[PDB]
Design a protein around this ligand. Sequence first.
Ligand SMILES: [Zn+2]
Ligand SMILES: [Zn+2]
Ligand SMILES: [Zn+2]
Ligand SMILES: [Zn+2]
Lengths: 370, 369
Amino acid sequence: MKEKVVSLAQDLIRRPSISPNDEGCQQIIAERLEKLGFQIEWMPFNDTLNLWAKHGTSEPVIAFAGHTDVVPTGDENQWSSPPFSAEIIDGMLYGRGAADMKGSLAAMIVAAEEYVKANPNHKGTIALLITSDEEATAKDGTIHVVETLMARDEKITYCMVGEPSSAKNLGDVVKNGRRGSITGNLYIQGIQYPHLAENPIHKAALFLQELTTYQWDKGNEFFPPTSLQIANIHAGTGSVIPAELYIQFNLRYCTEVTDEIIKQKVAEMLEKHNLKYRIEWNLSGKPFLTKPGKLLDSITSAIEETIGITPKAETGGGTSDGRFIALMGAEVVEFGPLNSTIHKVNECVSVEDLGKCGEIYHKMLVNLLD
Amino acid sequence: MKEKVVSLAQDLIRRPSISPNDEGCQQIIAERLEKLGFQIEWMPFNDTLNLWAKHGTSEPVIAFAGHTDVVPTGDENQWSSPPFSAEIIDGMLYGRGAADMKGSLAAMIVAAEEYVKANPNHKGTIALLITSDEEATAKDGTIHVVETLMARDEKITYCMVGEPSSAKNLGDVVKNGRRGSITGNLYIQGIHLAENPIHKAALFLQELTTYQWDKGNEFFPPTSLQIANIHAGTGSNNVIPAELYIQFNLRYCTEVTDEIIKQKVAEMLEKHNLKYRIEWNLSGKPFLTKPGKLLDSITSAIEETIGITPKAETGGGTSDGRFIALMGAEVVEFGPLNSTIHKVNECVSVEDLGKCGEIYHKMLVNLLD
Ligand SMILES: [Zn+2]
Ligand SMILES: [Zn+2]
Ligand SMILES: [Zn+2]
Ligand SMILES: [Zn+2]
């Protein structure tokens, strides 16, 4: 299935899809899947295109997730092959999007096609979730598609996000979760003998010692303990006595705590120190974790039996859309090609590796459903 | 001398000298003082025009101090006489700066002149120290004059600051004390959980913001600390993000000194093993003028002229007194009713301006002979 995958990857790479502009990538994918019996559901929002393509109508629902947008190229004269030509030189496919993530998007799509072709009455649902904006703002992409599925109680049981997850050798890492991120924007008002203890900056300092020493949880098997960072402290313009003290703090949290628990505990500490304040919360993502089980064995065993390596399961890896998908109760894992050339001049990926990815994604489906 | 004082006050009131812009006020003062035997020395810095004028060479040096700047007028609709027209109506001079403090500036000026004309061989030195920014940022005014004087070891023995001191009746109050001003600029560096520099720096901040420096005394209210700046982290265009910067000011009474403040701050930092640098800026020292030559000279001057005894008070309104006390001068302040200052329809009694002129003159006669 190598050449089918490479062939699709080149069609996609030749469409310059700088976020959020899809440049027809999703439409050629749709056209193609439509002819093979997939139901095609378009979920554009503002300037972003999203696609939800399904074969089958029941649980378990296995989605392959990914994105067709790429980051900008830089000056194209720094490139050895032109970035949107999709040349193959000596078994390597060059192009912007080759590694992140048009190659593996193609691998996943071709895996899905060959499976449903060989198994037209498979149980469950094989689906593709594709956004045109993961790399930029990412407000109107996967989250919009997720919110839409959720508003009508449609399920995803399992999800494989094909971001390039491999560090040193193909297959060496699979991501099975990520810590949550929440940010507090805190504004202490009225900061100007007798009653020195009642100064709001003093009460703020007391709160801060408590906030920086509070142990939220003890982490667990899969995550270090929840960490709090003071990002910024700001009062004063650099000369005029300031009316407010601004404190910004971020928690990177694990599954032992929720955001509601963090918000209610911070509120509690502020009340306990009798502070008057305003706070604005920014939730970037809730934590997700796929524990060893069906999904993680299916991909782990797929890698071992395809390329003879045992991947390490890892949490972290920076931003994907996995954190959004996990909100609907889907179990999320991520796996794809080497990530060493992503976002750089001369981004490229092994034609051989793309083939192997195709076979790994296909074998995951066999392990999950056969 | 009422008419010379009123006339000079009007010439100043008409110049819209919004801080720090002198609008030629000091030049008109310099011109007349120069026509008598005064040495004129300008000490401009940045946007502010300073003026140090003296007659004589021997100590004691007696400095009259004040400012030519005024706070903004507000909407000129609400004045019943335009804020810079300097109109006299039913015995009142109306204008921005009538009360604070061009009226008393004029009175101290005419008093200094009259004394000098009548006593060319007087002992001591009679000086004027005038700035065009007391009311706003006040970084390049009196502070700059005192820096310059102190650098060349020039002394002021006595100082009368002409801020309007009277509360209800002309002469009912003389200010004999002010708190000092020191500013600390602190850079805490490098910013299992109780050992993080942020935690330790929060403990320090706790301390700094409730440590009771003193409870004041018989003559003063308590020393106060206020934070002007706290910055840490990458946000807000911070160019030293890995430092916790705290700038804070102490307005301090005689119960403590600059040395106790610095030592104590250093001690608190040490207790937390914080790596830090600190720069201190002492701009003003506290003063309390006790009974004696200076305080008697003005108390008696007011008793002589109007038949009232001033009570001695600390604080109230603002002045450059503490900036002058930094150099070891003894300081008192006296002037007109202050109830219209910084307000619409600021004004001042012209008879009070005359009386002020007499009082300042009598004070010179009392101090010298
Ligand atoms: Zn990327
Ligand atoms: Zn990506
Ligand atoms: Zn004043
Ligand atoms: Zn004033």
